[PDB]
Write a protein that binds this DNA or RNA. Sequence first.
RNA 1: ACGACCAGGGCUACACACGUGCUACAAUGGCGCAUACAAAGAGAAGCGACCUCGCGAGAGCAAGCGGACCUCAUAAAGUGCGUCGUAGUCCGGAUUGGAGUCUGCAACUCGACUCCAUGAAGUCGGAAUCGCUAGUAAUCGUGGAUCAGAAUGCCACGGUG
RNA 2: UCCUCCUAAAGAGUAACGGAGGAGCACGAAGGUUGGCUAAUCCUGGUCGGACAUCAGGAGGUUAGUGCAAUGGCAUAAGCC
Lengths: 177, 116, 66, 83
Amino acid sequence: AKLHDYYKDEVVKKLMTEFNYNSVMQVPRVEKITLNMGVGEAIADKKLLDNAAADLAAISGQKPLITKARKSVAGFKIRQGYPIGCKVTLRGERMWEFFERLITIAVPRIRDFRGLSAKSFDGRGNYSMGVREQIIFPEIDYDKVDRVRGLDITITTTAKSDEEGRALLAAFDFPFR
Amino acid sequence: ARIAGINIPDHKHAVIALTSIYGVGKTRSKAILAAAGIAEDVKISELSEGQIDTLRDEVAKFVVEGDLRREISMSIKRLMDLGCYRGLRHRRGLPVRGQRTKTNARTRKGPRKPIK
Amino acid sequence: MKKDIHPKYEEITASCSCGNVMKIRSTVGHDLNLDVCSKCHPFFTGKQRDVATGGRVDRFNKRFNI
Amino acid sequence: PRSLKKGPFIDLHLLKKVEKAVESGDKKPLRTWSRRSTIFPNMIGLTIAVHNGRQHVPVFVTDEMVGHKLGEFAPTRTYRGHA
RNA sequence: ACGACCAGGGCUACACACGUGCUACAAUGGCGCAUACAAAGAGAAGCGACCUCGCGAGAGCAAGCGGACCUCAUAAAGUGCGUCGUAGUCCGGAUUGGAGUCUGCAACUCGACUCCAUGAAGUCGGAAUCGCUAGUAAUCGUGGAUCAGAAUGCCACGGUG
RNA sequence: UCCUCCUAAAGAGUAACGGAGGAGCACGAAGGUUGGCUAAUCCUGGUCGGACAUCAGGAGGUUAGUGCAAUGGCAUAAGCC
Ligand SMILES: [Mg+2]
Ligand SMILES: [Mg+2]
Ligand SMILES: [Mg+2]
Ligand SMILES: [Mg+2]
Ligand SMILES: [Mg+2]
Ligand SMILES: [Mg+2]
Ligand SMILES: [Mg+2]
Ligand SMILES: [Mg+2]
Ligand SMILES: [Mg+2]
Ligand SMILES: [Mg+2]
Ligand SMILES: [Mg+2]
Ligand SMILES: [Mg+2]
Ligand SMILES: [Mg+2]
Ligand SMILES: [Mg+2]
Ligand SMILES: [Mg+2]
Ligand SMILES: [Mg+2]
Ligand SMILES: [Mg+2]
Ligand SMILES: [Zn+2]
C-alpha cells in the first residue's frame, strides 16, 4: 500500500489541478489488475496448465482461477468446458504491492526494454500490456523452470476518457516512452 | 549470473560463459576480465557480487544484446531501402559477398528446392 | 482472502546495484539481490543514445581531408 | 575496399561534370560510364545515369548513397526466375 | 565487315542435376603456454633482415643478397604442462554486419588478407562407389610454376608411419 | 403406430398417394429444494494467439439458452452455477 499511500496524497493533488474536477470522487483511480495466462496448449495435458497456474501463483500470491472455454471452436480443437487458461484478479492492498513490484522490478528486468505503448488504452482508459517471458519477475527461479510462459497484465481503472488513464499511470511514472 | 539482460551459466569458466552475451566473443571476454581484474579460469560460481557489479559495468561499455540486434537490422534495412546490389542480395536471399550461386549457396538459400 | 489455498506472501528486502534498498511483500521467502531497478535503469538516459543512426556524409568527411 | 591513405576515387571527367552541374544548376540526367567512382556529398540531389552494360539507368542521389560507388545502383544482370 | 579501335558489361547469373576437391562432425581432440627434429626450392621492375610503429593484416626507415654466404623462413604433426569433460559443446566454421590493410589507373558487379562481432548445416553419411602391397596408404607441414594482386587446383619436398 | 407445423375457413374437430420435419430415447442427476447468477453477436486493447481459445472495457438486449424435431412457452426465468 506504499503506492496507495503515494496515490492518496500526491497523485490526487496532481490530477485535480490538471483536469479541474469539481469533486475529489471525480478523479480516476485504479480498480483491479487482471493476470491472464491464455494457455491454449494445455489441451494436450493438464500438467502444463497445472504448472503455469503454479507459476502465476508465484508472481501474484493468489491461487489462480482456472478459466474454461466459453464455447466450442474447431479451429483450436477445443470444446466448451475445457480448462484453457488461468486468471488472477488483484484488488485492494494486493493490487498495489504487485503494482509496486511490477513497475520497479519486473519492467526493468525486461530484456531490451525500451518503453511501453501509449496506444494500449482500449478507448476507455483501461490499460493492457503483455509480457513475453515470466523470468522478468524475480519470483521465478531460473534453474527450477523449464518452459517460457507468457502472461498479460490488464489494469482496469475508473478513468472515463482515454487520456485520463494515460495521465493516471504517468503520475505513477509508468514507463510509456 | 545475470549480465546485460540475459542469464549466464555458472558451471562454465569465466571467459566462456561471458560469450553467451550476443556481442562478445573469446577476444572481448579476455578484454572484459582484464579490465575487471578477474582471472579467466574461475567460474561464474564463487564470484563476489561486487565482482559481478564490476563485470556488469565493463560489458555496459560496449554494444550488446538489445543494441546490437537493432544496429545490425538497421544496417541491413539501410541497404534494403537504397536498392544497391548488396540490398538486392539481402532481399533475394542470395549471398551478398560475391560467392558462387551456381553451386553451394545453401546457407543463404536454405535446403534444396526441388523442381515440381 | 481464503485461508489455505494461497501461497506464502511475506515481506522481504530487495537491494540493487545502485543501493536502492526497497522492502516489498513477496512470495520469494529468501532475501533478494537485484540488478537494475526503476531508479537505476537506463531508460531515461541510456535508451536515448541507443538509437545511433549516424550520418553518411559525416562518415565520409572524417576519413580524410581534401 | 580502398586504402584510407589513397582517399576516395572518382573519374576526372565525372568530377568536372559534377562541378559544372552544381554551378550551372541544371537537372539534366548526366549519363556516365564511371561505375567505379565513389559518390561525393556534393552530388546529392542529382540525376546521374549510370551505365549498366546495355543502357543508362538514372540514379537519384540520396544522403545515404555517399560512401558507395555508382555501379552498385546500376545492376548489370537481369534475372527474373526460372519458373 | 565475319576486319580494326575504345568505354562499360559479361565470361563469376541460379528453381536445379553431376564430377573432382577442401574443412568438418571432435577427447588418438579443441585450446593456452613452453619446447625438439626437416628436405627441396625461388630471388634484381626481385628476395627483402635488423630496428621502430600498429591488436592485426601491414607501414616506415633500411642492411645483406644475382646468392652452399643474404633473404623468403619460426617447419608442422611431436613432446612437456595446464585446460575443457560429451553437450551442437571452449566441437564445427558457414553466413552476415562493422572496421581495415595491401595490390592495382581502378577492387560495385568481381580480388586477397586482417580485426571485432555473428556462430548455419553437420553428431560419420541410402543404393552405390574409389584409392592403395612399404617408406606404400593414412596424416603433417614446406616450396615452386603461372602471377601487379588473386588457390582448397597443379607440380615438387621432407616428417611421422 | 406416435409427435410438431400448415392445409383447418379467428372455440373443438376436419380429408387427399396434400406441403414440411421428427420419435421407438436419455438422465441416480439432466430429479427435489435452498441460495446465487444472466445470454448471442460485434468493437476496441492485450504474450505465444492466428477468422476464431483465454483476459480487460463497450455496444447490444435474448437475435442466446432448453439432452433431441417443430410449435407454444420461458427473466419471478422453465436458461446457468
Ligand atoms: Mg557471443
Ligand atoms: Mg572470430
Ligand atoms: Mg573491353
Ligand atoms: Mg569459366
Ligand atoms: Mg614466387
Ligand atoms: Mg608489436
Ligand atoms: Mg602440443
Ligand atoms: Mg589437451
Ligand atoms: Mg571453435
Ligand atoms: Mg542440427
Ligand atoms: Mg558430439
Ligand atoms: Mg603393385
Ligand atoms: Mg602470386
Ligand atoms: Mg381451429
Ligand atoms: Mg371456425
Ligand atoms: Mg432440464
Ligand atoms: Mg432459484
Ligand atoms: Zn537499482
